[PDB]
Symmetry: C2
Subunit: 135 residues, 2 copies
């Protein structure tokens, strides 16, 4: 097996966030996914822990609504058979206000049977909040 | 080879931060280490990028001065031959003020010849700042 599930997920998520085409993402997310993105839910209600595909698709819908990503930079990637860790920077612009924002994130993923079963994301949340408030 | 350099580094760093015994850490840090911890240097001057062992030992000295760690929790660990990624939570208390603080971090490390040559750390910097300010 020669195309890692991480890459498939990354493409599927791109389609969902940028083109609002969510079919590939829905295929890849496990029905019982165990998910968390650590950040301030008061500002970004789509952060936090979620269980199950439906709730994770809702997170991704809210993110798609909020941002458009125009550049990706992959800084570190550690691949295993059914797992991966990586560090990536997103350059985006915020819907409506068109605020530019750069987000640096660290992602740990687990897969089973080609589906995403576990995700944990840490990002530079202070830098994010500062950029969003612009103060 | 059966004891990963990540574990050796983790022990060495513990000695330095908690016991102010830095000899093991100094052995393990490469002379030309390429280091960064992403966070707000205005609050934590020991954050940011550094090059070389001397500058990284200074970061670690400043951290040792500032905190004592009383609990570790390792959430995810992805080990390779000369590399690792992991997610860990530190429970600490701040020097002088004795403020309790929990820090969730994602660490990517590279090693060569048993020395740490590259480190990148992302943490939940908003949560950290909030806890430190207590407001």
């Amino acid at each position: 097996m020669t195309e890692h599930s991480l890459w498939r997920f990354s493409r599927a998520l791109h389609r969902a966030l940028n083109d609002r085409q969510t079919e590939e993402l829905a295929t890849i997310i496990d029905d019982n996914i165990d998910w968390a993105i650590y950040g301030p839910i008061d500002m970004f209600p789509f952060f936090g822990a979620r269980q199950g595909k439906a709730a994770v698709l809702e997170v991704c819908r809210q993110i798609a609504d909020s941002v458009r990503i125009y550049r990706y930079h992959r800084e570190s990637v550690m691949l295993g058979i059914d797992s991966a860790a990586s560090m990536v920077r997103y350059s985006l612009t915020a819907a409506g206000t068109n605020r530019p924002i750069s987000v640096r994130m660290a992602l740990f993923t687990q897969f089973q049977n080609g589906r995403l079963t576990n995700l944990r994301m840490v990002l530079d949340t202070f830098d994010l909040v500062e950029q969003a408030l612009g103060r």
